[PDB]
């Protein structure tokens, strides 16, 4: 099946890479804002938590 | 894991952080309980006969 | 066969190159701090704890 | 299956499924016994064939494989192909399927590797005779439909591909490479490839572009010419022949680097010339960027005909279609020379006729004004520009203009742009000059300058054939020693001719754009104009413009803004060539300074265009390095730095835009999401990089001619309210313009929200106001494309003034330049000998379904709509013709082009 | 944040019903199709005319 | 000595590896591009030479080297001399002999009578390298 078989293996190979890009992004580390104000907001909440306003 | 869990399995939880522990044996199904409380039987064709 | 081949050629270089670009950029983000990106993940868990109570 | 001996012919077939008694035993014993019995084997050859034929109706591996096993051996094991030359030569026809049975029917790595070499070799040797062709044909046209032959014919072809490809990369080549052990191209193997190619062109399509590409020579393409030109009507029909040619050509732009891509497309022009539609020829000729290919079709219709007939009208039409008018100049001159009539021919070729129909189209669309009339402050300046922006194209609004009140209330550089915005009312219209003339002879120099810009804009609709040209008016002004005047003059001249080259335009820009010794920042326009003339066609890579860049840098390093514009102009100049642009890359790189490198990356986008995936990895390493260098640290210099950083960002983008149009339409989609993800990325990394990346995004989108226009701008638009540079909005609207009030309804909403909602600075406000009005045209008066129309994978020339202005910060000074954003796309209508101003009917279909196109030629189904339509933008670009049913036949194919229709009623 | 209350409103679907299972009355099809289906295909006709699409 | 402390190499390393991945994935395009590239280089020069382009690339035959003498308790050793030197490292941790120098005209005492333990040595000429170690007991006594 050579003309179509060889290239079909390559198409699957291309699906693998599209998945890896996905698994990298959401764990090291998904955006909610631009990226930068979601990091600082985590350090901002530490300040609120030490306080008993809540 | 979560690859063992589907919706509507009773689970045991361990009180401390409510960590999921195991699947419990019995499952609840609502359509089973509707004909049990109505309490219709089911019966054979020979019984209808005449 | 060649109809498959022109798509294979565009799709591979553009996508795999992009994949490489992400890998370098997590690291570079790390540098002004000392580990920004891999720590934002540890912070999110920490802040939220377990359990999370629905309201 | 059952063994039932030589009783009848049906039970011979069953016999040989297990073990033949007239193929293996006999022939083997016979060959290995006496040597007069090779003559008896030759008679038995006929026998071997009939039996093969009967069992090529089976598909089970076991019973053809095992059966025929020892013949495949006998070749090397006992005969050793040396007992004689012709006698082993001509008996390879039963042994070749026997070989195929371990290659293809079974698959086993140890045997498949080893016998692969053996199949190649005997394919080559046995094709001199040409008996190898006939075995191949018996499977391609089949005997029965079962799965087997569908893979068996596939392997035989794949042999040839294997070897040829391996001879080009390796420095070893020939038959001493060990890929298939078989000769390079030979001398009597050459003829074998030609014979295979015919049969496979008839029945298949697969290997036909492929064969060409493996050789990598235009010669393979010229061999193709010969066969295809016979075939054009008796083997399959003409329409079909066309869809094949272009599939090869567009597809294989990714597989072709520059000196090769131009040479392949020469041939594709010749196929079209051999065939009847000289209209398909012209499409390709524009594509080359050659003056020569266009002249030949024009000479082909004009010269052999000693009458008007269809033939002269058909020539004029073909040359009219570019909206640059790169074709308008070339086709003119032979009309003047032949002389059966001047009056019809000259108007019809030129953009003189496109004016008459524009008025007719305007009548459907009407004129609806919705502009604000805010007076005083920078708010004054905003409202005076917006009126011109709302009435792009021929529109009319004379009386408001005639009152000099709102004119005299403009001030500054603002005043200049106000007179200039008036010219865009009279875009593609001769008349207007009267309004313009008034300002030119009275008041401050400011109103005088703005008149010349406005003349530029207006004059673009009538200039070809040098009949009352912009050149006539604008020369006096150039001579004049004041800088503001002359800069204005030579800008309007660049616009007016657009992509048309001529002796007069060129020669005006030749003793200027070469004095940059004394400091100014408005002699940007100097080179900018010369760059504009060149685009859309062949280049000389002119020394005037390269020289003046050098001199500018030597004289001053204060005016980083001047040199930033100058840099971008070089890159626009070179647009329209790429092979020569390599020669001059070295010249620019000769003098080295970190300052010089900022220009280098820009010029890189054109040089590398068409071998543009070498261009992608470079423009990306270039980006990462800033962040990396910074890293180390974390854990006059000013002018170089600022220029340095912004250029890389422009160049990267520039690279993508030129590449994506020419190469695949498929990647265009990917490029829309990627760009936004790119902006966020830069925003983190380099502080300086962020302002530039915002603004570039709008022209990335317009240049490429994206299909998805609703979703992505709108998501980003909200984000860019917060972000710096409110000039970001102007650039977003340039893409959105499309068919107006499809895309542009959400654009208005989105931009008008941000502007009313927060006023954080009236500077910030001005940009936001311009954008909302810019984006619309009342009920799709005229769409804008950077695309030509005539090709969707070619590139504009009118739109290159829009492109310039996204690399720098906003200023009232900038405002004067943005008034121009010329380029119009005519709606198609059916023309007769009295130039009728309506169409009958057209089909529109958002995108063609077909896969056997990649350039476009619609399906016939479509969606029917009535008379007098504007040709919709992307998301409706394919426009097809309906007339066939009323017994009427088009002469001029449309595919989704700009081109006008001409019809024959019977 | 999905509800089963919304799913009651929604359908899961691939009808057996297609136009031209309508045995005649062709004109009536091309008054309904002019009303329901057509402004999704083209909003272009209705803005070009300047009418508000029929509800 | 051996030290495992570094931490500035990370930045130079991060682009260096970025290039190694990028070129592999780019490779598909680059085969076709290289076909034209070659015929100029063959004509002119390889980079700026005519030498070491007569092979497959610049080598043919075994490209690697390795030598081992560690992670073995005996495999190789052969004969190795040692002499006593001032202002030089010398370890009686490595070896089990250690020989005395004859730069000195004096000689060490009698060589090995063999065996192991606390063993009395005996020989008939003192003229062989042996050496002396000094004793804390003599100092006390």
UniProtKB/Swiss-Prot annotation, chain B:
Post-translational modification: N-acetylated by NAT1.
Disulphide linkage map: none
Compartments reported by the entry: Cytoplasm; Nucleus
Domain of life: Eukaryota
Subunit structure as annotated in this protein's UniProt entry: May form a homodimer or a heterodimer with a related family member. Interacts with OLA1, TMA17, and UBR1.
Other notes: Present with 4700 molecules/cell in log phase SD medium.
Function of the protein: The 26S proteasome is involved in the ATP-dependent degradation of ubiquitinated proteins. The regulatory (or ATPase) complex confers ATP dependency and substrate specificity to the 26S complex.
Recorded family membership: Belongs to the AAA ATPase family.
Protein name: 26S proteasome regulatory subunit 8 homolog
Gene source species: Saccharomyces cerevisiae (strain ATCC 204508 / S288c) (Baker's yeast)
Residue window of the full protein shown: 103 to 152 of 405
Swiss-Prot record, chain D:
UniProt-annotated stretches for the region Disordered: 1-44, 170-191
Ranges of biased composition (kind: Low complexity): 179-191
GO biological process, one term: regulation of protein catabolic process
Annotated PC repeat ranges: 417-449, 450-487, 488-522, 523-563, 566-598, 714-745, 746-780
Any Pfam family the entry gives: PC_rep
GO molecular function: enzyme regulator activity; protein-macromolecule adaptor activity
Its job: Acts as a regulatory subunit of the 26S proteasome which is involved in the ATP-dependent degradation of ubiquitinated proteins.
Record family assignment: Belongs to the proteasome subunit S2 family.
Protein name per Swiss-Prot or TrEMBL: 26S proteasome regulatory subunit RPN1
Organism field: Saccharomyces cerevisiae (strain ATCC 204508 / S288c)
Curated annotation (Swiss-Prot), chain E:
Subcellular location: Cytoplasm; Nucleus
Gene assigned in the entry: RPT2
Organism annotation: Saccharomyces cerevisiae (strain ATCC 204508 / S288c) (Baker's yeast)
Cited function: The 26S proteasome is involved in the ATP-dependent degradation of ubiquitinated proteins. The regulatory (or ATPase) complex confers ATP dependency and substrate specificity to the 26S complex. Has ATPase activity.
Protein name: 26S proteasome regulatory subunit 4 homolog
The family this protein is said to belong to: Belongs to the AAA ATPase family.
Curated annotation (Swiss-Prot), chain F:
Designated name of the protein: 26S proteasome regulatory subunit RPN2
Coiled coil feature spans: none
Biased composition (Basic residues): 26-35
Residues found modified as Phosphothreonine: 17
Note: Present with 4750 molecules/cell in log phase SD medium.
Post-translational modification comment from the UniProt entry: N-acetylated by NAT1.
Organism: Saccharomyces cerevisiae (strain ATCC 204508 / S288c) (Baker's yeast)
Biased composition (Basic and acidic residues): 36-67
Gene symbol of the encoding locus: RPN2
Entire protein: shown range: 785 to 925 of 945
């Amino acid at each position: 099946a050579a003309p179509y078989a060889a290239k079909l293996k390559q198409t699957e190979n291309d699906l693998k890479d599209i998945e890896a890009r996905i698994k990298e992004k959401a764990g090291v580390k998904e955006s909610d804002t631009g990226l930068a104000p979601s990091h600082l907001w985590d350090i901002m909440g530490d300040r609120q938590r030490l306080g008993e306003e809540h | 894991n979560v690859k063992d869990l589907k919706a509507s399995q009773r689970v045991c939880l361990r009180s401390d952080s409510y960590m999921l522990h195991k699947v419990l044996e019995n499952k609840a199904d609502p359509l089973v309980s509707l004909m049990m409380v109505e309490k219709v039987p089911d019966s054979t064709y020979d019984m209808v006969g005449g | 066969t060649r109809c498959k081949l022109k798509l294979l050629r565009m799709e591979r270089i553009k996508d795999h190159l992009l994949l490489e670009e992400e890998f370098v950029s997590n690291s570079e983000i790390l540098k002004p701090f000392e580990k920004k990106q891999e720590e934002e993940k540890k912070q999110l868990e920490e802040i939220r704890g377990n359990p999370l109570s629905i309201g | 299956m059952v063994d039932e001996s030589d009783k009848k012919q049906q039970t011979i077939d069953e016999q040989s499924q297990i073990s033949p008694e007239k193929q293996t035993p006999n022939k083997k014993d016979k060959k290995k016994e006496e040597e007069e019995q090779l003559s008896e084997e030759d008679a038995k050859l006929k026998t071997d064939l009939e039996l093969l034929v009967e069992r090529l109706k089976e598909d089970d591996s076991s019973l053809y494989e095992a059966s025929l096993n020892a013949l495949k051996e006998s070749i090397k094991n006992s005969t050793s192909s040396m007992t004689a030359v012709p006698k082993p030569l001509k008996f390879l026809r039963p042994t070749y399927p026997d070989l195929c049975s371990i290659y293809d029917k079974w698959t086993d790595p140890n045997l498949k590797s080893s016998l692969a070499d053996v199949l190649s070799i005997l394919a080559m040797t046995y094709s001199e005779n040409g008996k190898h062709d006939s075995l191949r044909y018996r499977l391609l046209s089949d005997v029965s439909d079962f799965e087997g032959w569908g893979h068996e014919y596939i392997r035989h072809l794949a042999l040839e591909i294997g070897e040829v490809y391996n001879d080009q990369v390796e420095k070893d080549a020939e038959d001493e490479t060990s890929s298939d052990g078989s000769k390079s191209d030979g001398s009597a193997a050459t003829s074998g490839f030609e014979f295979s190619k015919e049969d496979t062109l008839r029945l298949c399509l697969d290997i036909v572009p492929y064969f060409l590409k493996h050789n990598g020579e235009e010669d393979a393409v010229d061999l193709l010419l010969e066969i295809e030109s016979i075939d054009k009507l008796p083997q399959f029909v003409d329409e079909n022949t066309f869809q094949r040619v272009c599939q090869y050509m567009v597809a294989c732009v990714p597989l072709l680097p520059p000196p090769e891509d131009v040479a392949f497309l020469k041939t594709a022009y010749s196929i079209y010339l051999s065939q009847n539609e000289l209209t398909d020829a012209i499409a390709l000729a524009v594509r080359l960027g050659e003056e020569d290919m266009i002249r030949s079709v024009f000479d082909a219709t004009s010269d052999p005909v000693m009458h008007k007939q269809l033939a002269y009208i058909l020539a004029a039409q073909k040359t009219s279609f570019e909206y640059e008018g790169v074709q308008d100049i070339i086709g003119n001159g032979k009309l003047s020379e032949h002389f059966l009539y001047l009056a019809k021919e000259l108007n019809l070729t030129g953009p003189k006729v496109p004016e008459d129909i524009y008025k007719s189209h305007l009548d459907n669309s009407k004129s609806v004004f919705s502009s604000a009339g805010l007076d005083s402050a920078q708010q004054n300046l905003a409202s005076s520009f917006v009126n011109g922006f709302l009435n792009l194209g021929y529109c009319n609004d004379k009386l408001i203009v005639d009152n000099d009140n709102w004119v005299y209330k403009t001030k500054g550089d603002g005043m200049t742009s106000a007179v200039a915005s008036i010219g865009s009312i009279y875009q593609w219209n001769l008349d207007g000059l009267q309004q313009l003339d008034k300002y030119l002879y009275v008041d401050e120099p400011e109103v005088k300058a703005g008149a010349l810009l406005g003349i530029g804009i207006s004059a673009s609709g009538v200039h070809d054939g040098e009949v009352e040209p912009a050149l006539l008016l604008l020369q006096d002004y150039v001579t004049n020693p004041d800088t503001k005047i002359s800069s204005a003059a030579i800008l309007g001249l660049g616009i007016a001719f657009a992509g048309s080259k001529n002796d007069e335009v060129l020669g005006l820009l030749l003793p200027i754009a070469a004095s940059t010794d004394l400091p100014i920042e408005t002699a940007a326009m100097a080179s900018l104009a010369l760059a504009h003339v060149f685009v859309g066609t062949c280049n000389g890579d002119i020394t005037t413009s390269i020289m003046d860049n050098f001199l500018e840098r030597t004289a001053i390093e204060l005016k980083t803004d001047w040199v930033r514009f100058l840099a971008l102009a070089l890159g626009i100049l070179y647009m329209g060539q790429g092979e020569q642009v390599d020669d001059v890359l070295e010249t620019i790189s000769a003098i080295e300074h970190p300052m010089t490198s900022a220009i280098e990356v820009l010029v890189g986008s054109c040089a590398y265009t068409g071998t543009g995936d070498v261009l992608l990895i470079q423009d990306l390493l270039h980006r990462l390095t800033p962040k990396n260098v910074k890293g180390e640290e974390d854990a006059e210099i000013k002018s170089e730095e600022k220029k340095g950083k912004s250029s890389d960002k422009d160049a990267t983008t520039d690279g993508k835009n030129d590449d994506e149009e020419e190469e695949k339409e498929a990647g265009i989609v990917d490029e829309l999401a990627y760009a936004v993800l790119g902006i966020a990325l830069i925003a983190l990394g380099e502080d300086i990089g962020k302002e530039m990346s915002l603004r570039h995004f709008g022209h990335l989108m317009h240049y490429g001619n994206e299909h998805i226009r609703r979703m992505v701008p709108l998501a980003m638009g909200i984000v860019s309210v917060s972000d710096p540079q409110m000039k970001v909005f102007d650039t977003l609207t340039r893409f959105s313009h499309d068919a107006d009030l499809e895309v542009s309804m959400n654009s208005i909403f989105a931009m008008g929200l941000c502007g009313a909602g927060t006023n954080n600075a009236r500077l910030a406000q001005l940009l936001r106001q311009l954008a909302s009005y810019y984006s619309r045209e009342q009920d799709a008066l005229f769409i804008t494309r950077l695309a030509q129309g005539l090709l969707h994978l070619g590139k504009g020339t009118m739109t290159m003034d829009v492109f310039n202005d996204a690399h720098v910060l906003n200023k009232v000074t900038l405002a004067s330049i943005l008034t121009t954003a010329v380029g119009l796309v005519s709606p198609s209508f059916m023309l007769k000998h009295h130039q009728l101003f309506y169409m009958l009917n057209a089909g529109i279909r958002p995108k063609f379904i077909l896969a056997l196109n990649d350039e476009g030629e619609p399906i016939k189904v479509n969606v029917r709509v009535g008379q007098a339509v504007e040709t919709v933008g992307q998301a409706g670009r394919p426009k097809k013709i309906t007339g066939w049913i009323t017994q009427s036949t088009p002469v001029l194919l449309n595919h989704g082009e700009r081109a006008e229709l001409e019809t024959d009623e019977y | 944040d999905a509800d089963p209350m919304v799913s009651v409103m929604k359908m899961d679907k691939s009808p057996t019903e297609s136009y031209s299972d309508i045995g005649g009355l062709e004109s009536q099809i091309q008054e309904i199709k002019e009303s329901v289906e057509l402004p999704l295909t083209h909003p272009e006709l209705y803005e070009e005319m300047g009418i508000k699409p029929p509800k | 000595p051996r030290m495992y402390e570094e931490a500035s190499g990370k930045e130079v390393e991060k682009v260096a590896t970025a290039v190694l991945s990028t070129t592999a994935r780019a490779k598909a395009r680059a085969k076709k591009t290289k076909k034209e590239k070659g015929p100029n280089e063959e004509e002119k020069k390889k980079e700026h030479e005519e030498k070491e382009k007569e092979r497959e690339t610049n080598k043919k035959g075994i490209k690697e080297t390795k030598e081992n003498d560690e992670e073995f308790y005996k495999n190789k050793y052969s004969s190795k001399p040692y002499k006593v030197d001032n202002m030089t490292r010398i370890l009686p941790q490595q070896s089990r002999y250690i020989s005395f120098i004859k730069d000195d005209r004096f000689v060490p005492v009698r060589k090995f009578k063999g065996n192991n333990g606390v063993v009395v040595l005996r020989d008939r000429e003192p003229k062989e390298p042996v050496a002396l170690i000094e004793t804390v007991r003599q100092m006390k006594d």
